[PDB]
Coordinates of C-alpha atoms and ligand atoms in Angstrom, one line a residue:
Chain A
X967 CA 194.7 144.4 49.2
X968 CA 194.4 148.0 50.1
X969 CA 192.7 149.2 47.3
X970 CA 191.4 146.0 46.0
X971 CA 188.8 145.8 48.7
X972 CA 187.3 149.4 48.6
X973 CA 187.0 148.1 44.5
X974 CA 183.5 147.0 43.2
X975 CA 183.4 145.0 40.2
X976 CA 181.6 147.4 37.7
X977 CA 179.0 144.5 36.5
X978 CA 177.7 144.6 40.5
X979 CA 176.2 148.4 39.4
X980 CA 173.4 149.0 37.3
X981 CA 172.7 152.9 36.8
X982 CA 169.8 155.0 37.2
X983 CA 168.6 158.3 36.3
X984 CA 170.1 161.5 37.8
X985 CA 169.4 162.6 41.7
X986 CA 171.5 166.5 41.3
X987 CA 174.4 167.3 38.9
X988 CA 180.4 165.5 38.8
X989 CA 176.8 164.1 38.7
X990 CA 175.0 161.9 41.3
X991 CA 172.9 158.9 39.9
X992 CA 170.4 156.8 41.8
X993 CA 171.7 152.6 41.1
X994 CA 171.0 149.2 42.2
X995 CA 174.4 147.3 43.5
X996 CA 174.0 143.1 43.6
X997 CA 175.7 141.7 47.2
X998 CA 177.2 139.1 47.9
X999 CA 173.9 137.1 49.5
X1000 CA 172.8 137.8 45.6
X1001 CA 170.3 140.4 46.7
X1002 CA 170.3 143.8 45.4
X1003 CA 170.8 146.8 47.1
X1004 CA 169.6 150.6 46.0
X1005 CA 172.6 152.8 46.0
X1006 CA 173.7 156.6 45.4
X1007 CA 176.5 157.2 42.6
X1008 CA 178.7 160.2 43.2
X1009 CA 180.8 160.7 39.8
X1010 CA 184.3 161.9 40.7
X1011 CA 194.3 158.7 40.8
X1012 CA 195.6 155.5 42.8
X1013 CA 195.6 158.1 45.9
X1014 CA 192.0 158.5 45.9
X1015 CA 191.8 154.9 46.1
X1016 CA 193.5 155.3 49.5
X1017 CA 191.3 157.9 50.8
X1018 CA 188.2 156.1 49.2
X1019 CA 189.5 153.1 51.9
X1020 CA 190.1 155.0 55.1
X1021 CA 186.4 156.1 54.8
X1022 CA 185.4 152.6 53.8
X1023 CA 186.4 151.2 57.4
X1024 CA 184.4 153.9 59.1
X1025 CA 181.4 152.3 60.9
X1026 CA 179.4 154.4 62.8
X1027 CA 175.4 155.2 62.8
X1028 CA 175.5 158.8 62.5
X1029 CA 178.4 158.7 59.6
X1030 CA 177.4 157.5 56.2
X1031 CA 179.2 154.3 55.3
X1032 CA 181.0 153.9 51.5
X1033 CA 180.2 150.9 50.6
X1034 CA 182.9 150.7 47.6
X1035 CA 184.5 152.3 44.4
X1036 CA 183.2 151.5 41.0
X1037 CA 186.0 152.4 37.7
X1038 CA 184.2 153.3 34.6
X1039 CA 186.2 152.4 31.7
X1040 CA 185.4 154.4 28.5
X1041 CA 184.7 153.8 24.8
X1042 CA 188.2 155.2 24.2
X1043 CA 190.1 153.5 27.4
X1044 CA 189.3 156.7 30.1
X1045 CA 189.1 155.5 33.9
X1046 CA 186.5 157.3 35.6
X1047 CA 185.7 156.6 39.0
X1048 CA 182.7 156.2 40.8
X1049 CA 181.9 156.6 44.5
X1050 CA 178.9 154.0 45.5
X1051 CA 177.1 154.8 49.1
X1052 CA 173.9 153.8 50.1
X1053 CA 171.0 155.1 48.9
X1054 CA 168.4 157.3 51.8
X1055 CA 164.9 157.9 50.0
X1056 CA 164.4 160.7 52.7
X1057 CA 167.2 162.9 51.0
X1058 CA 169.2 165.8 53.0
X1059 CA 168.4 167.6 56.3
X1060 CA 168.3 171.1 54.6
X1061 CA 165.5 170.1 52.2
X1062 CA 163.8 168.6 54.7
X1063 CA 163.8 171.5 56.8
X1064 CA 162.3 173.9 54.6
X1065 CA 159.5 171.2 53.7
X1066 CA 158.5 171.1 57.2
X1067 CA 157.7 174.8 56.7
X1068 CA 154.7 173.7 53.9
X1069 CA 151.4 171.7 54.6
X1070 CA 151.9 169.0 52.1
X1071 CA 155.5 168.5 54.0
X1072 CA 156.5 166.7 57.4
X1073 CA 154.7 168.1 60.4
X1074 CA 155.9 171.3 62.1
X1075 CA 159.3 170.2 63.8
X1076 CA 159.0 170.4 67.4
X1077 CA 162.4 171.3 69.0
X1078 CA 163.2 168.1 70.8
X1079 CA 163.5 166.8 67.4
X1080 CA 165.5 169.9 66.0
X1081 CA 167.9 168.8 69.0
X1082 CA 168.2 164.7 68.5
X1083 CA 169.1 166.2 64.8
X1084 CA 172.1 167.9 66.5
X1085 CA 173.2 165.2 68.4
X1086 CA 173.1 163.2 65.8
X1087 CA 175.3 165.2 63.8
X1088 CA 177.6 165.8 66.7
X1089 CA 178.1 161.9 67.6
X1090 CA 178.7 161.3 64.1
X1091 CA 181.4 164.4 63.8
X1092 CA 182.6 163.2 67.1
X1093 CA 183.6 160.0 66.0
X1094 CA 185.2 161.1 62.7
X1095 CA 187.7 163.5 64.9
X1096 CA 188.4 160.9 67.1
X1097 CA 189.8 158.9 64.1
X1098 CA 191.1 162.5 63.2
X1099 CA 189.7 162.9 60.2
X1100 CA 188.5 166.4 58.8
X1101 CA 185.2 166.8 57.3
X1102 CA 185.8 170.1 55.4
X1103 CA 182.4 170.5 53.8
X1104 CA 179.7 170.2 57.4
X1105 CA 176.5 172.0 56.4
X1106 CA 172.7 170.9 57.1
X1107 CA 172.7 169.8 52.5
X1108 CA 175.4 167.5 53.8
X1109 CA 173.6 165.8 56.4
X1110 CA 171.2 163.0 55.3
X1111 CA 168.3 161.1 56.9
X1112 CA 168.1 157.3 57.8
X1113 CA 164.9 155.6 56.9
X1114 CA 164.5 155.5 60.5
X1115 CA 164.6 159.4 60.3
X1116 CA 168.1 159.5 62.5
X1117 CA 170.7 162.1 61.0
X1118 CA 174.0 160.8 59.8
X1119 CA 177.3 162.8 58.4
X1120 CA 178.0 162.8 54.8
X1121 CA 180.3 164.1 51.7
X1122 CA 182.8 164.7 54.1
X1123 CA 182.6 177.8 47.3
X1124 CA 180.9 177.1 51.0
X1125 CA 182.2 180.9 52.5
X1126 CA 179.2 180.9 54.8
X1127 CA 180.5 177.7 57.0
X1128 CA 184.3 178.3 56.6
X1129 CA 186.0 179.5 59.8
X1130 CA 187.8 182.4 60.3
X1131 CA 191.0 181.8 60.4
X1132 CA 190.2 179.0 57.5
X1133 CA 188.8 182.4 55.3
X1134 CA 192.1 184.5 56.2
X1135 CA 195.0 181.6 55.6
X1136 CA 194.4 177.7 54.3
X1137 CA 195.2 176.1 57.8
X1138 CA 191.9 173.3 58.0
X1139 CA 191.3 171.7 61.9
X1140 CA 188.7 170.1 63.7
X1141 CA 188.0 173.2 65.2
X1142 CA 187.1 174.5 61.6
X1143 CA 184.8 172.1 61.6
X1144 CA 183.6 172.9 65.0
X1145 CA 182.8 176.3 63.6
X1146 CA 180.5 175.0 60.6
X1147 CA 178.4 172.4 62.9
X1148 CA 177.9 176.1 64.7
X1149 CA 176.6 177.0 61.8
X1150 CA 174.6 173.5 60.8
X1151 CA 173.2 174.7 64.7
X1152 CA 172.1 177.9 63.5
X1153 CA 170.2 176.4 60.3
X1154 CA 168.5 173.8 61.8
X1155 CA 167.0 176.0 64.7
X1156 CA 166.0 178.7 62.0
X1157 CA 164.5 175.5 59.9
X1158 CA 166.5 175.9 56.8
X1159 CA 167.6 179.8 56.6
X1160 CA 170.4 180.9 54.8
X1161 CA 173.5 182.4 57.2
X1162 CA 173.7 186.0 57.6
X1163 CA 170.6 187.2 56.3
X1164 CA 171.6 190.8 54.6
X1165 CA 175.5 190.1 54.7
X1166 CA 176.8 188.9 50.6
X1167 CA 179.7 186.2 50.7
X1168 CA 182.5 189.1 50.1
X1169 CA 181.8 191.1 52.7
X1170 CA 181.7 187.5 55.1
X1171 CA 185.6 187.7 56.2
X1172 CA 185.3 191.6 57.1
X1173 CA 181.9 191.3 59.1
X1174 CA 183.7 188.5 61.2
X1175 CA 186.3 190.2 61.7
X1176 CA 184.7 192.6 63.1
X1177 CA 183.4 190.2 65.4
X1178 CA 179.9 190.1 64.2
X1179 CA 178.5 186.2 64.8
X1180 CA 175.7 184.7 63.5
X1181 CA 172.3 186.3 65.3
X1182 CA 170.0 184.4 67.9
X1183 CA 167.0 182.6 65.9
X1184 CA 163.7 184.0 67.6
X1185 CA 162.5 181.3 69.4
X1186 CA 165.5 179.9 70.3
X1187 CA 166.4 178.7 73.6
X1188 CA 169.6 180.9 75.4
X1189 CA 171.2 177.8 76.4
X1190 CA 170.5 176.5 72.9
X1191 CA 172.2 179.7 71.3
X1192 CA 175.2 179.7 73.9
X1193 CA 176.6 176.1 72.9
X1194 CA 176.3 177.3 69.3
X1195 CA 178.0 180.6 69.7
X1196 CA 181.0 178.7 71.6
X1197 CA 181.1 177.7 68.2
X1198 CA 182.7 180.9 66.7
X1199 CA 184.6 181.6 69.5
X1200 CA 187.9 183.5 67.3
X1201 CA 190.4 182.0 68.6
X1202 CA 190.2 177.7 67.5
X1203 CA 191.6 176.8 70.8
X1204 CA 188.6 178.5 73.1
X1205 CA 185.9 176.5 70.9
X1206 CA 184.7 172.9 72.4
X1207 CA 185.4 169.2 70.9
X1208 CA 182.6 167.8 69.2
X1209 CA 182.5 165.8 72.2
X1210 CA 181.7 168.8 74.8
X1211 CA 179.2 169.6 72.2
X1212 CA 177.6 166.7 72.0
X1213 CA 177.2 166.0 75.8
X1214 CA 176.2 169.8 76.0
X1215 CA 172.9 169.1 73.4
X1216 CA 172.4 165.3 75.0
X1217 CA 171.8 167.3 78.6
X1218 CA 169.8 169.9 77.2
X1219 CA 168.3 167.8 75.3
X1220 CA 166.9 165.7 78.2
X1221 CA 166.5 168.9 80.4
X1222 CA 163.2 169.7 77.8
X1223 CA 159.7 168.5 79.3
Chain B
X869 CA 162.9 215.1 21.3
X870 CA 166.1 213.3 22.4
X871 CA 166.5 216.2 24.8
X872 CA 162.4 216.9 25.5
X873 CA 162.5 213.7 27.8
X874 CA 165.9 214.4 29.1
X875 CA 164.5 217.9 30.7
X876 CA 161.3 216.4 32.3
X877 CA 163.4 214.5 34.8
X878 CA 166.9 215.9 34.7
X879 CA 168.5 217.1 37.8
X880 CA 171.5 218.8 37.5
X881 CA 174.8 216.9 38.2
X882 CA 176.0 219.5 40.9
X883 CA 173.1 219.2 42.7
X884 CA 173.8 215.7 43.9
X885 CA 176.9 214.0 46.3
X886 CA 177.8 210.7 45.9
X887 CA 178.4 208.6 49.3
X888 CA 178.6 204.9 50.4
X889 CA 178.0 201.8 48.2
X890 CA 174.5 200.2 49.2
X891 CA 174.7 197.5 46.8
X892 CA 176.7 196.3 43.8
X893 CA 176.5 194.8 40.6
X894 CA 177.3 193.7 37.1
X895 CA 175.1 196.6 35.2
X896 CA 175.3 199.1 38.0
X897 CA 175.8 200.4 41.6
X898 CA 173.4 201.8 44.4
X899 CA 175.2 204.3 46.4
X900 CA 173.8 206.5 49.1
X901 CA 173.5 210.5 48.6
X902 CA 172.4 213.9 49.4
X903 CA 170.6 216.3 47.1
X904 CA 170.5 219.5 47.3
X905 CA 166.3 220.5 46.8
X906 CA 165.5 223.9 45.1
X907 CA 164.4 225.2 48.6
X908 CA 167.7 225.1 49.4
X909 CA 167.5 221.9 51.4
X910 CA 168.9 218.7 51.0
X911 CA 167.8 215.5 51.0
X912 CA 168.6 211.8 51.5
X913 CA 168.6 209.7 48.4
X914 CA 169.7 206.4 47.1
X915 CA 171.2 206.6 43.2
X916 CA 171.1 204.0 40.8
X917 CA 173.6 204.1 38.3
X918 CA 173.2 202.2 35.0
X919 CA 175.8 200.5 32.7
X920 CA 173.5 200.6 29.2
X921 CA 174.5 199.7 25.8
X922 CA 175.8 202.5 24.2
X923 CA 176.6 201.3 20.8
X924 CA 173.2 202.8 20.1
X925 CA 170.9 205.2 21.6
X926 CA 167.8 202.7 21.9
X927 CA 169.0 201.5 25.8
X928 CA 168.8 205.5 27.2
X929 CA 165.4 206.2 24.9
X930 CA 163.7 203.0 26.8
X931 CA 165.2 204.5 29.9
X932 CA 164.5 208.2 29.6
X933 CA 160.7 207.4 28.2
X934 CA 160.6 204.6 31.8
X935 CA 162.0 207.8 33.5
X936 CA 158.9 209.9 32.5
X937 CA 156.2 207.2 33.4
X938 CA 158.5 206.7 36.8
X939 CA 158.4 211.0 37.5
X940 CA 154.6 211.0 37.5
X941 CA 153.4 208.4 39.5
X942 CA 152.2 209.5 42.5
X943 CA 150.2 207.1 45.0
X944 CA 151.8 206.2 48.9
X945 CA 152.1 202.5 48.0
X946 CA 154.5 203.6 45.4
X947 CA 158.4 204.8 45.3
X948 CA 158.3 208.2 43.3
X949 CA 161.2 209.1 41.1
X950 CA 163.1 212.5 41.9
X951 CA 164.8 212.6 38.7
X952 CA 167.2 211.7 36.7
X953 CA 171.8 212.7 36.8
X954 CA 174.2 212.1 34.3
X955 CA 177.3 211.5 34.3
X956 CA 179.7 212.4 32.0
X957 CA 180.5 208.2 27.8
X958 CA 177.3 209.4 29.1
X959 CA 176.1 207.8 32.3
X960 CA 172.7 208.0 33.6
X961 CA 171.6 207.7 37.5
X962 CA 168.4 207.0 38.9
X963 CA 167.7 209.6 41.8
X964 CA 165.5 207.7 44.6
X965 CA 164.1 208.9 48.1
X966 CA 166.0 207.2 50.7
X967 CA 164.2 204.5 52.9
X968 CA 166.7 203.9 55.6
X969 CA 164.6 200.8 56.5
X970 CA 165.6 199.1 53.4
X971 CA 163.8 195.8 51.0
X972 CA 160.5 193.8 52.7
X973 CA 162.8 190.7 51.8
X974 CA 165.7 191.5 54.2
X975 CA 162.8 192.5 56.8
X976 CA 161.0 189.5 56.8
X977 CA 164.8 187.6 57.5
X978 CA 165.3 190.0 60.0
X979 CA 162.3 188.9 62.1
X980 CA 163.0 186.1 62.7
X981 CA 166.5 186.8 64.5
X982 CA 165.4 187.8 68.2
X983 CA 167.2 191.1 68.0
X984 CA 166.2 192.0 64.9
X985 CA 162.2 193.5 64.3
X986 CA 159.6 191.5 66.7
X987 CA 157.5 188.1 65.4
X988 CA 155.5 189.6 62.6
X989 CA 152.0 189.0 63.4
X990 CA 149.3 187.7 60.6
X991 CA 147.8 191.4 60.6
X992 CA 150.7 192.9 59.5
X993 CA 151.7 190.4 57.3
X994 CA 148.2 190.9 55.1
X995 CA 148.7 194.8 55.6
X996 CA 152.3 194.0 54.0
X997 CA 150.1 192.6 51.1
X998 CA 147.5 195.2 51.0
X999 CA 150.0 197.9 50.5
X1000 CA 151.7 195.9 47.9
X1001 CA 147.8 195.3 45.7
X1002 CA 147.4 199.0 46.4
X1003 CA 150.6 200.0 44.6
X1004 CA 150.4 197.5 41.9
X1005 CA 146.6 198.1 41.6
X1006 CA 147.7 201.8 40.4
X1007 CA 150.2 200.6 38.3
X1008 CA 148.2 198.6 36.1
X1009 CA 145.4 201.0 36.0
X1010 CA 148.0 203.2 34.1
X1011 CA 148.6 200.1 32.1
X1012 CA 152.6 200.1 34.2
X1013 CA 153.7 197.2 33.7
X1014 CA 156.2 196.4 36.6
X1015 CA 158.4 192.9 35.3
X1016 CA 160.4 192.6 38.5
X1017 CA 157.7 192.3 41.1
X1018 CA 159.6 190.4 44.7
X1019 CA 159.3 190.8 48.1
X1020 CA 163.4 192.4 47.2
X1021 CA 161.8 194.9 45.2
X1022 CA 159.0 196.4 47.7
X1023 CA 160.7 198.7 50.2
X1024 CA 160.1 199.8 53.8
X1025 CA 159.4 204.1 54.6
X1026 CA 160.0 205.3 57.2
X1027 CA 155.9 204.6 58.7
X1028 CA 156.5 201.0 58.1
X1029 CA 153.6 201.1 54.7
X1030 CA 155.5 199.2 52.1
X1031 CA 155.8 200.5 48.2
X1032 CA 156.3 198.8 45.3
X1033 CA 159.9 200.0 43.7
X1034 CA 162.4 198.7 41.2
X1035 CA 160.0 198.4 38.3
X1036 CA 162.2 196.3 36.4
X1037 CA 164.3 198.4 35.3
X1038 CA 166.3 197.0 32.4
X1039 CA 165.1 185.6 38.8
X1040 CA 163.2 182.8 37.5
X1041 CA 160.9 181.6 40.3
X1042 CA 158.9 184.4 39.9
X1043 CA 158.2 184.7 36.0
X1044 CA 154.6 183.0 34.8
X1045 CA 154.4 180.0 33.2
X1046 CA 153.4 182.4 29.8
X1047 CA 156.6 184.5 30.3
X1048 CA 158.9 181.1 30.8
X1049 CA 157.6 179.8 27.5
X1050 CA 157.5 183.3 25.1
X1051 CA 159.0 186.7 26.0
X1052 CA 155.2 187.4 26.3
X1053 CA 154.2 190.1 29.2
X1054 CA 151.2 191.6 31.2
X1055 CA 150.0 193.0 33.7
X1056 CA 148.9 189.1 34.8
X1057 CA 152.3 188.0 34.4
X1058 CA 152.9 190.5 37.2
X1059 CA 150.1 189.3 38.8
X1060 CA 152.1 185.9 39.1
X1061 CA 155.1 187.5 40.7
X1062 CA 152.6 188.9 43.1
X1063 CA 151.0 185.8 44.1
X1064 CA 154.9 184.9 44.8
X1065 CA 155.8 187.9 46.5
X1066 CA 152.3 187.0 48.6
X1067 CA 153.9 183.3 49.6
X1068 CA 157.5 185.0 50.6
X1069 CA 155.9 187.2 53.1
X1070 CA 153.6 184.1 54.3
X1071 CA 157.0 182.3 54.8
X1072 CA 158.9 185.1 55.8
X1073 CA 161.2 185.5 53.4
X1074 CA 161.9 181.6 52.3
X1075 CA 162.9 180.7 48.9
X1076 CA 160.2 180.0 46.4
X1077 CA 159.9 176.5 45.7
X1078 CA 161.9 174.4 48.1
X1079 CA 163.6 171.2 46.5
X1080 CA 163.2 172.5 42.5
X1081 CA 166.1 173.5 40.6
X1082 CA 165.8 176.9 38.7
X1083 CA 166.1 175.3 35.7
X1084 CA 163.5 172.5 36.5
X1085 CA 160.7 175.4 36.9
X1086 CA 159.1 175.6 33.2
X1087 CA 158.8 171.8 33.1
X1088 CA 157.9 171.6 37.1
X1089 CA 155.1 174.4 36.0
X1090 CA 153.6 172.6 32.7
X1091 CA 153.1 169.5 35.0
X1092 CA 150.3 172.0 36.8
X1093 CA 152.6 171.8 40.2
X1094 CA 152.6 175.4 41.7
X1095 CA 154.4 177.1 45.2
X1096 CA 152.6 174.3 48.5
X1097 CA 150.7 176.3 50.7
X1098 CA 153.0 177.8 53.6
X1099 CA 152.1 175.3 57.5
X1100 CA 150.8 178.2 59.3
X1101 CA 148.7 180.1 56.4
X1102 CA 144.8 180.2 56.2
X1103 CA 143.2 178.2 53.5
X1104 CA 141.2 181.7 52.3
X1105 CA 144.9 182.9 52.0
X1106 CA 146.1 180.5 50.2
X1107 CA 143.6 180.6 48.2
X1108 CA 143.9 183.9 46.6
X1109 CA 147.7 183.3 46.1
X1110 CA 146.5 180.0 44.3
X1111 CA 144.8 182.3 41.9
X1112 CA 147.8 184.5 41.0
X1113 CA 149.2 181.4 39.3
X1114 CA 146.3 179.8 37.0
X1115 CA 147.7 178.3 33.8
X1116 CA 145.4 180.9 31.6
X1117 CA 146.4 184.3 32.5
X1118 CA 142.8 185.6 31.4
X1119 CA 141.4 183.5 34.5
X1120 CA 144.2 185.3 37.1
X1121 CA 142.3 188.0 38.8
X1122 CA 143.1 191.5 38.2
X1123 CA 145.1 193.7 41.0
X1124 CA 141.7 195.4 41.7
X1125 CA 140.4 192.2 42.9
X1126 CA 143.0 190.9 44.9
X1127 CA 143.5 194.3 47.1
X1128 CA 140.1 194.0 47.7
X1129 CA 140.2 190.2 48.6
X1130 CA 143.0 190.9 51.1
X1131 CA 141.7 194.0 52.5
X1132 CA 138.1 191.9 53.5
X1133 CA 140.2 189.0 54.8
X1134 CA 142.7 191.7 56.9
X1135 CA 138.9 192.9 58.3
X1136 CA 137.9 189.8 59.4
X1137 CA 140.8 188.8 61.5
X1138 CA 141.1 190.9 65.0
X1139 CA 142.7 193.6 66.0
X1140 CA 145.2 191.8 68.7
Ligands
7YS2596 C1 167.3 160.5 47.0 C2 168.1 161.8 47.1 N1 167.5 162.9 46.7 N2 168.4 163.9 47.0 C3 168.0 165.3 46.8 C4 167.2 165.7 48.0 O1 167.9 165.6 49.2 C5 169.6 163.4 47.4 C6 169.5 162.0 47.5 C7 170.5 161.0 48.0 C8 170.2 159.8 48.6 N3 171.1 159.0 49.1 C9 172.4 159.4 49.0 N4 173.3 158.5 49.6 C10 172.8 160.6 48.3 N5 171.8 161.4 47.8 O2 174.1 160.9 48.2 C11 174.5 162.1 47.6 C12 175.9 161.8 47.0 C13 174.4 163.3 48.5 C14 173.7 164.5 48.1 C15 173.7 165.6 48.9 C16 174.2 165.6 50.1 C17 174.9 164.5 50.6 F1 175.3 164.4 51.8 C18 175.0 163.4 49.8 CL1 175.9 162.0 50.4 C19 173.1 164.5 46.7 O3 173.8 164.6 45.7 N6 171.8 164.5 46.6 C20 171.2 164.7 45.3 C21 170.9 164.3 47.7
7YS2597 C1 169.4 201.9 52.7 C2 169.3 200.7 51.9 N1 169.8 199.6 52.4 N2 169.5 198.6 51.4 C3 169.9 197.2 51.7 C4 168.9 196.5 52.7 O1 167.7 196.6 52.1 C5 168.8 199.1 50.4 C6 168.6 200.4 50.6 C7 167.8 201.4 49.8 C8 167.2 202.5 50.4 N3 166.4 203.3 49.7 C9 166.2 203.1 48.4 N4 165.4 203.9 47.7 C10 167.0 202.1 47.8 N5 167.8 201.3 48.5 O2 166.9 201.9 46.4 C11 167.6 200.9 45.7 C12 167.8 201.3 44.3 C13 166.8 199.5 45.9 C14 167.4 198.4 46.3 C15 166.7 197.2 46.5 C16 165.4 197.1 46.2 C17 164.8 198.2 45.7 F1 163.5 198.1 45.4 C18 165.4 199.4 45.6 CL1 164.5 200.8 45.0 C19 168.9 198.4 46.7 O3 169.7 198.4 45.8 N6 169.3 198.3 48.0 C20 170.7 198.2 48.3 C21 168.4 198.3 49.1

């Protein structure tokens, strides 16, 4: 029962070309009111089933939704399994970003949408550590648009958004994650710039050790760059919930004319 | 011979102290240094050391022979070469004036972190350009060709007028659509790379071509789709980017025409 409801009978999914190489296909998924539904195809053994359900039961607007499992069996009898979500034509935030930046792209981003962006995230990563569950991989590329152009949470190496203490020993927390929606701050107020412009991915650990953080964008509010700085705070215990954070960007959010 | 273009730019080992690591590689470090002039001086330099194929000597005889074209050129817009060190399995090093202000690329980054350099007005942005045509514009007119032409490669002195440096020496989003295809080259190839060197500095120091992989970028070209025009640009901008990029290299416009193209258009903007 467990894993038998996060299972989709294969002959539900038809497959499409390739969206980005394990390779992600774009599909078409019959329901059960014998309607088809477009879908996104992440190509990945009884544990991950069990994983696979705990994010199935999330339900939550800002957190993408897995609407099942799909096993591919091969020519020569291989399981390979097949993670079916739903598919958003308006792609990630990080893309978006930068497109915003060219004419033929969305309009110039005005900051009280760079903000809803960040609530958005941070009700969505809210309500994932509230079920205590550890996104590990939070970065503006993860984060994907609604049709109705609200920002949800999704796939939940990356040294640029890794913590700290999470770069020195293994130890993951939601505090970790605090640290990389710090980060996801950062690149959505500079429109889509890479982290630590001039500082290469092995230096990273020994520049933040140093205490060296992540520099104010230039048009970027003080009270904007204060909530994000909290953020890298070096000790985990100093930085806020996801639920400060979110209450924080709500407020100044609504303090904007 | 072997030794004739050896003694034309050779500096002799003792003359030079190695310092700091400015930037590392796979074929070769950049390290910071002092050397010591014949006035009894010494100056600041950055060294490029080079890990060449020595299995034969044809790797050091298209250095050395670069190394002599690199010794004479001698224009503002353009990084002069103070000679060259070996070190002894011979090793050769590229001796380079020191610009303490660094790459155009990391600048452009820079500016738009409120403590690093101010909001880089439009002015500056085209006299970034301009200096850029100038130095290319005398390359070419000693038929130079350049090969690694990026906002990475032009360097800041110390009066904030940028040169052109590098010279490829020895990655994708900045080769023509003829150079993708065949291992063809000219100087309007490097006229592409300039035309995407122009759209970096427009952006401020964004990635070429947003969204495309760099292995979707010959077929992404063929289909006649080029770099979008950055939100804030001028169409009379754009335009002569636009150019840099024509499918027929014979129709892109030579560095002569460009640095005058940008110079009228920097004239006809004010002075504020
Ligand atoms: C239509 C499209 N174009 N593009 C490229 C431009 O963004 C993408 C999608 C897309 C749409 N819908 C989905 N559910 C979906 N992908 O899911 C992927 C598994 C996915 C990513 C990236 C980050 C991330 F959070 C997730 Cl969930 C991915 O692989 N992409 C190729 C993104
Ligand atoms: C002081 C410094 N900080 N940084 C890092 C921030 O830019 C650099 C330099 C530097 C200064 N002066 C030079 N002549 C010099 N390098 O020469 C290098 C051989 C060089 C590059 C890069 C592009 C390029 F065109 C050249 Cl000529 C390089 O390797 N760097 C590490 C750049």
């Amino acid at each position: 029962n467990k894993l038998e409801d996060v299972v989709i009978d294969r002959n539900l999914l038809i497959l499409g070309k390739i969206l980005g190489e394990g390779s992600v296909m774009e599909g078409n998924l019959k329901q059960e009111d014998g309607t088809s539904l477009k879908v996104a195809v992440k190509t990945m053994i009884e544990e991950f089933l069990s994983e696979a359900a705990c994010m199935k039961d999330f339900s939550h607007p800002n957190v993408m939704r897995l609407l099942g499992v799909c096993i591919e069996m091969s020519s020569q009898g291989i399981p390979k399994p097949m993670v079916i979500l739903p598919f958003m034509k308006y792609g990630d935030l990080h893309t978006y970003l930068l497109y915003s930046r060219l004419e033929t792209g969305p309009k110039h981003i005005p900051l009280q949408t760079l903000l809803k962006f960040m609530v958005d995230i941070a009700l969505g990563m809210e309500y994932l550590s509230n079920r205590n569950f550890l996104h590990r991989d939070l970065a503006a590329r993860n984060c994907m648009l609604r049709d109705d152009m609200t920002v949800c949470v999704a796939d939940f190496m990356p040294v640029k958004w890794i913590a700290i203490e999470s770069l020195a020993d293994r130890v993951y927390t939601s505090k970790s994650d605090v640290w990389a929606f710090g980060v996801t701050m950062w690149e959505i107020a500079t429109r889509g710039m890479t982290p630590y412009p001039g500082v290469q991915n092995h230096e990273m650990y020994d520049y933040l050790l140093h205490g060296h953080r992540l520099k104010q964008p230039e048009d970027c509010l003080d009270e904007l760059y204060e909530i994000m700085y909290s953020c890298w705070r070096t000790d985990p215990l100093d930085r806020p919930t996801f639920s400060v954070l979110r209450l924080q960007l709500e407020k100044l959010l609504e303090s904007l004319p």
